[PDB]
Ligand SMILES: *[C@@H]1O[C@H](CO)[C@@H](O[C@@H]2O[C@H](CO)[C@@H](O[C@@H]3O[C@H](CO[C@H]4O[C@H](CO)[C@@H](O)[C@H](O)[C@@H]4O)[C@@H](O)[C@H](O[C@H]4O[C@H](CO[C@@H]5O[C@H](CO)[C@@H](O)[C@H](O)[C@@H]5O)[C@@H](O)[C@H](O)[C@@H]4O)[C@@H]3O)[C@H](O)[C@H]2NC(C)=O)[C@H](O)[C@H]1NC(C)=O
Ligand SMILES: C[C@H](N[C@@H](CCc1ccccc1)C(=O)O)C(=O)N1CCC[C@H]1C(=O)O
């Protein structure tokens with residue numbers, strides 16, 4: 001009978017979770033070794049261990065049918081069993097799974113191994129994205145130089161893997177259908193446990209979209225004054241190579257030429273960091289300090305012993321794209337980052353340490369619950385601290401910002417700078433998954449795959465390639481997450497919910513009061529706040545033990561994902577910018593791009 005079985009089921013789950021953690025540890029070590037050191041041998045090792053774990057998962061999913069788990073009284077036991085039924089790629093036949101792994105490593109290794117020739121020196125051909133190409137994209141204001149590096153990178157990181165990407169789409173679809181999802185889009189969306197999640201995001205995006213259009217319009221206007229009308233048109237999409245980022249996902253690198261008040265201070269602490277002799281180690285130690293200051297968990301010795309926080313100086317190939325790793329034991333957590341001493345990198349350090357903190361907070365949970373409440377929660381943690389670190393308030397405390405006067409104009413500059421990262425990113429993030437969803441769902445014919453990408457980038461972000469592209473090119477995989485098969489919606493969710501977390505943490509810290517002019521949201525510093533840390537502890541320690549609205553409720557008593565907080569943060573900017581665009585007769589919106597030939 002069911003009472004006796006449920007008791008047996010509890011014991012079954014307890015043992016199985018511990019077994020799954022141990023088996024996943026082995027897979028994770030092999031994946032770490034490959035990412036840290038790309039070789040044919042490490043690839044083979046990584047993929048063979050994954051195939052072995054996949055085989056075990058199949059047996060697990062099969063064994064769940066021996067339990068009447070849907071009949072059980074315990075919501076907790078039912079939730080754990082449900083988690084185990086979800087095979088993902090491991091549902092594929094043995095041979096198909098092996099082919100998918102080989103396809104995935106082919107794409108990620110291609111991305112990681114991209115090298116281009118110097119614009120001025122065709123003999124020097126060892127320029128990698130990180131740091132060489134990204135340095136040019138972020139710093140150069142020579143539009144032809146920028147266009148050169150754009151084309152070279154997209155051709156090598158994107159177009160080169162079209163056939164592998166096509167096969168990946170086929171196998172991802174096959175896997176999804178074996179799990180009885182319609183496509184990989186539904187498989188990804190399942191992580192958010194909400195059948196209205198897409199509509200919710202459409203509604204939030206629509207509310208914020210008008211603010212994006214104002215920022216876009218103003219940036220385009222300012223770029224015209226810098227580059228001239230031969231390079232930037234008033235009415236067309238912005239040429240994306242001028243936006244300071246390879247994918248135009250964040251525009252903060254061009255703040256010095258588009259800032260509302262160029263005669264007033266604009267926060268850029270990179271120079272001071274270098275002057276004061278900052279190192280990657282110091283940046284991570286400072287991140288550690290921020291977390292512990294909030295009464296959260298200190299980084300364990302394994303982190304310091306085993307992390308890679310600087311680009312290796314030997315000849316080896318590796319994945320330099322920053323990442324945080326859980327090894328599913330106790331206190332074995334690691335970061336791999338090719339750390340540079342810049343302001344932007346200080347934020348990346350805090351982002352990655354947010355992941356690490358989440359790992360530490362939930363490591364006592366059973367294996368199946370050792371992940372984020374939803375993928376967006378995991379991405380949000382570090383960014384909440386980054387919002388605080390980025391404030392003039394905090395940066396003055398740590399001696400990185402000197403002789404700063406926070407008048408009305410300096411505040412607008414700072415808000416605009418933040419928006420160049422936070423608002424600009426929203427349409428970008430949405431398009432990454434809108435694109436892949438449309439491919440997964442079979443909504444775009446193979447003949448139209450590349451122009452379908454640029455169509456979305458045009459429709460949502462109002463940006464376009466610097467040169468004419470066609471279906472002979474394939475540009476999507478030039479973005480890491482697309483080559484590496486990492487779901488992107490997590491970042492759209494994060495950029496919305498991080499402001500919900502930040503607003504609440506700031507209120508708990510006594511750092512934000514909407515009726516107090518001396519306590520504005522955009523200058524809140526949660527450093528040293530045990531009350532803010534307590535909220536994080538309450539939420540993060542849950543892991544995935546409960547549906548995400550329960551995790552949000554543990555933080556601040558709310559159960560709904562909302563664009564209220566992000567709009568509240570930027571409201572003073574919205575008011576000022578709307579007026580400024582009217583004052584300067586700024587054209588808003590854009591004509592359809594001519595840069596992808598069908
Ligand atoms: C995705 O969706 C798929 C459906 O589109 C689904 O595939 C189905 O899974 C079913 C398993 O749940 C499976 O059902 C079995 O069918 C057997 C006979 O199938 C043959 O004939 C069919 C035509 O009539 C064909 O379509 C098939 O291809 C086969 O040729 C049955 O023999 C079998 O039965 C046994 O099991 C049931 C279930 O028992 C349950 O558990 C306890 C006992 O442990 C019961 O007390 C309880 O009541 C409960 O029912 C017993 O009742 C029975 O006595 C037998 O022991 C069973 O019905 C089905 O064949 C399969 N395919 C199709 C096309 O339907 C996938 O599983 C889904 N995938 C995922 C990941 O969810
Ligand atoms: C730097 C960061 N890395 C990823 C890593 C994703 C990942 C998942 C699984 C395996 C390898 C890498 C992360 O979320 O930490 C990142 O890609 N981020 C942060 C914000 C937006 C997004 C971007 O830069 O596109």
Ligand SMILES: *[C@@H]1O[C@H](CO)[C@@H](O)[C@H](O)[C@H]1NC(C)=O
Nearest residue numbers: 037038039040041042314316
């Ligand atoms: C990289 O891997 C190779 C074998 O694939 C190994 O011999 C070598 O020690 C590794 N290099 C480094 C720097 O760890």
Ligand SMILES: *[C@@H]1O[C@H](CO)[C@@H](O)[C@H](O)[C@H]1NC(C)=O
Nearest residue numbers: 294295296530531533534537
């Ligand atoms: C730190 O957290 C613990 C529980 O994790 C709590 O009991 C303690 O009160 C906190 N310290 C402070 C100063 O709030």
Ligand SMILES: [Zn+2]
Nearest residue numbers: 351355378379
């Ligand atoms: Zn992240």
